[PDB]
Ligand binder design. Sequence first.
Ligand SMILES: [Mg+2]
Ligand SMILES: [Mg+2]
Ligand SMILES: [Mg+2]
Ligand SMILES: [Mg+2]
Ligand SMILES: [Mg+2]
Ligand SMILES: [Mg+2]
Ligand SMILES: [Mg+2]
Ligand SMILES: [Mg+2]
Ligand SMILES: [Mg+2]
Ligand SMILES: [Mg+2]
Ligand SMILES: [Mg+2]
Ligand SMILES: [Mg+2]
Ligand SMILES: [Mg+2]
Ligand SMILES: [Mg+2]
Ligand SMILES: [Mg+2]
Ligand SMILES: [Mg+2]
Ligand SMILES: [Mg+2]
Ligand SMILES: [Mg+2]
Ligand SMILES: [Mg+2]
Ligand SMILES: [Mg+2]
Ligand SMILES: [Mg+2]
Ligand SMILES: [Zn+2]
Ligand SMILES: [Zn+2]
Lengths: 55, 58, 100, 118, 83
Amino acid sequence: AIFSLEKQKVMKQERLQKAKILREKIKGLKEKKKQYYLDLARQKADKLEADKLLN
Amino acid sequence: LDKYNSKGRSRIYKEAVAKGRHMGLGKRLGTANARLNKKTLWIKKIRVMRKELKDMKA
Amino acid sequence: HKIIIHKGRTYKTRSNVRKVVKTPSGKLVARRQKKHAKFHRCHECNTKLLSIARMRPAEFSRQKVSARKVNRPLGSTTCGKCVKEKIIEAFLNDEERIVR
Amino acid sequence: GKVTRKIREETKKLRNPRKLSSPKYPNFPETTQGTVVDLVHERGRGVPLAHVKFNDEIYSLIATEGLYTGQTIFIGDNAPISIGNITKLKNVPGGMAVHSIEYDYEDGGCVGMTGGAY
Amino acid sequence: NGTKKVGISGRFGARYGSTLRKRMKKVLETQKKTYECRACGKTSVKRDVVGIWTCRSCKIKFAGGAYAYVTPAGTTFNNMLKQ
RNA sequence: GAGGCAGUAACAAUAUAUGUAUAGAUAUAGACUAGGGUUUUCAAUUUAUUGAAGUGAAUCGGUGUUAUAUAAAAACAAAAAAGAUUAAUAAUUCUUUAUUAAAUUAUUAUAAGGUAACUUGAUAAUGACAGUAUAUUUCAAUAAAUUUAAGAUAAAUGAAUUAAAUUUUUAACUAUGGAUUGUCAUGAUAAGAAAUAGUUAAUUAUAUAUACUUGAUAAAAAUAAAAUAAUUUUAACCGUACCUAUACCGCAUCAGGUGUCUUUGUAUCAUAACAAAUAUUUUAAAUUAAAGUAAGUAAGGGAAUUCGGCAAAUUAGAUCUGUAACUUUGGGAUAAAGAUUGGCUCUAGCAUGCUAGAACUUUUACUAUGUAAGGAAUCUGACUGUUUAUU
RNA sequence: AAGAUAAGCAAGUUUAUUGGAAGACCAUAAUCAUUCUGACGUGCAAAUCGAUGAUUUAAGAUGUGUAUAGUGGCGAAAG
Ligand SMILES: [Mg+2]
Ligand SMILES: [Mg+2]
Ligand SMILES: [Mg+2]
Ligand SMILES: [Mg+2]
Ligand SMILES: [Mg+2]
Ligand SMILES: [Mg+2]
Ligand SMILES: [Mg+2]
Ligand SMILES: [Mg+2]
Ligand SMILES: [Mg+2]
Ligand SMILES: [Mg+2]
Ligand SMILES: [Mg+2]
Ligand SMILES: [Mg+2]
Ligand SMILES: [Mg+2]
Ligand SMILES: [Mg+2]
Ligand SMILES: [Mg+2]
Ligand SMILES: [Mg+2]
Ligand SMILES: [Mg+2]
Ligand SMILES: [Mg+2]
Ligand SMILES: [Mg+2]
Ligand SMILES: [Mg+2]
Ligand SMILES: [Mg+2]
Ligand SMILES: [Zn+2]
Ligand SMILES: [Zn+2]
């Protein structure tokens, strides 16, 4: 059960990756989204609704 | 108009101290170290004496 | 009677440094300033690495590469005297192997 | 009556137990060579730890008495015996001082962890 | 120079007893002293943390005791390895 | 539902013959958050009632990361400032000059130069981390000079008082060199000093460099590339009025309580006190009671009063002499006990605003405010510390 | 108090500076509650007001976030 110091940084991030996914199984929490000026996927979709009214 | 306090009283009194009048023995209320620091007087002396030794060497 | 104008929160934390500037019309304002940054240091000898631009890492990515680096191998990490010990050491350890 | 102090202290250790490092050394088949990198200090314990480097991997170990940064040590079942080296138990003559003894083979260490005790 | 026989333990004043201040004078003399560097040969080794001694010039850390640079139980086990 | 006591206890009560003014009086004032929710502004009718109007964001907060299996409007993080407008909003509206990010356009270097430290389009860096003391006087502020303006005095005055602006070398590293040299303090050097030639920088006081205390050594994670010019019905969702105590909590327009910051002038250690600035405010009598709540003074005696000097009084700042028994050798000690102190005109030192001495003069000098009564013994606890919110 | 420098006398030892350690000493703002057994006592107030006192770089004071629940919790200890 002996590990190097350098391998222990990998096991922390792998532990902190599972904790990000188990949050979405808890009832009654607000959803985590991306920051708006970096999330380019939402800016494309809302603009598609925008010019649809123009027609 | 607004008011502003006059300093004509204090400008006169500061002139008599410039001749050394009002600094008696009966008008001191602090210690000798409070009115003049003893540490700064050593720094004034040792900085001037170190300057004049460089000029006499050059 | 003049009054200094303050805008924002009034706590004195690390990022809330302010100074007092005088306007042409006569106002007084407490303007905010940028966060204080320090010099980068060598990874081994721990001396101050000058000629590299010291700023916050957000603005540091906007600079040119000549202002981030020095024209030398390992120019971003080491001082330039530590590389002289490395090159002599790396060459001499090869000649010890060929004998033994 | 009420619950006394002794039982109330142990259940306060189950709500927030104390944390330490438990430093162990690896196992290698043959004799290798490693270098001492740096010396640090932890919160709870008084004895300083040491970071050694075997095969480009950095582990943590308890520092022996005369140790300086950059020194070289050997680890193996048949290493020569000197200050700071780690060998098997049968090689050392009678009368010396050892400070990390595993109970069984291929374990980290069990006996002699604190500073000043040998 | 001002003190007759107290020495470095004059900071404690007139409390904690008499023989408790004798035990402080033995330890505080060897902690604040500077020593020679075994690597570079200069007298610049000082202590900063319990069990860590470092030099000012060459900047190389040495392991050691709590309050002394060398331990009396540490030097006897160096002699038996020389033979 | 309504009596007696009873119109009794207890509280509130500035001046002017003409006034949107002339005076008096009390209270430091102004911004962010927690709490309140239209109290904001205007009109009409008398701290009320009704009716209209009012909150404008790519760069000000939230929405993002985490504190070793639900945590931050003060920790971390792409980017702005003046100058004016409204009855009420303004880093949000308008004018002027800027900055960030993403999508489409036009153009192109794939390396030169210096012995070296390094200079220019030519990537792989960090977020990121105790406390105390001393030395720098950056800014800023004072002080001086000058130029425009203001207000008062029966008179007099080398030209007073107030406002606005314009000005007042060091540390690393490299090349020669071969043995000395610095700081307020501790020092630095054959692992190359002084002296020369040169290349980088100088972190703006919440800074820089040193030193000191420790069985205390002083958090995490998301997060990165670069040359020049141009374009845009490109940059989403929520809050932006008002109050800081007569617009909060104590059943109230309650002498109580409540996180942070800023604030002018005289003030020879400071403190205390006064004045600026700003906000509020209208009308009974009086040389006369007793007994109360506060503040003063006292001939002669000086603790005889009392369970007990309970209450009050005396001492006190600063300079110079002088200092005991005892002791855990550090203390006791600022022990105790004496002497001096103003105003004006000069002389003498150098560090140039601090300190000694001398002459003349008076109903004699820290004392408006602030400021230790002292000594000799006994019992008990070692000391700094903590405790029955309300005997 | 350590540390450091000079001038004397002759292995040392007196005198004068520099330096700034300590759960050392004293005040303002802030905090607490010894005495008058003062004021008030159908009160300003279901614990307040005035004078006098004690306190100072720490075993301190304080906003927010997470953890501890009634035969249970927290406690430099008074039920
Ligand atoms: Mg009345
Ligand atoms: Mg209304
Ligand atoms: Mg307004
Ligand atoms: Mg504006
Ligand atoms: Mg607004
Ligand atoms: Mg507003
Ligand atoms: Mg408040
Ligand atoms: Mg009130
Ligand atoms: Mg009367
Ligand atoms: Mg009398
Ligand atoms: Mg009399
Ligand atoms: Mg009597
Ligand atoms: Mg009697
Ligand atoms: Mg009394
Ligand atoms: Mg005289
Ligand atoms: Mg006691
Ligand atoms: Mg009580
Ligand atoms: Mg103290
Ligand atoms: Mg009473
Ligand atoms: Mg429950
Ligand atoms: Mg009892
Ligand atoms: Zn280096
Ligand atoms: Zn060394």
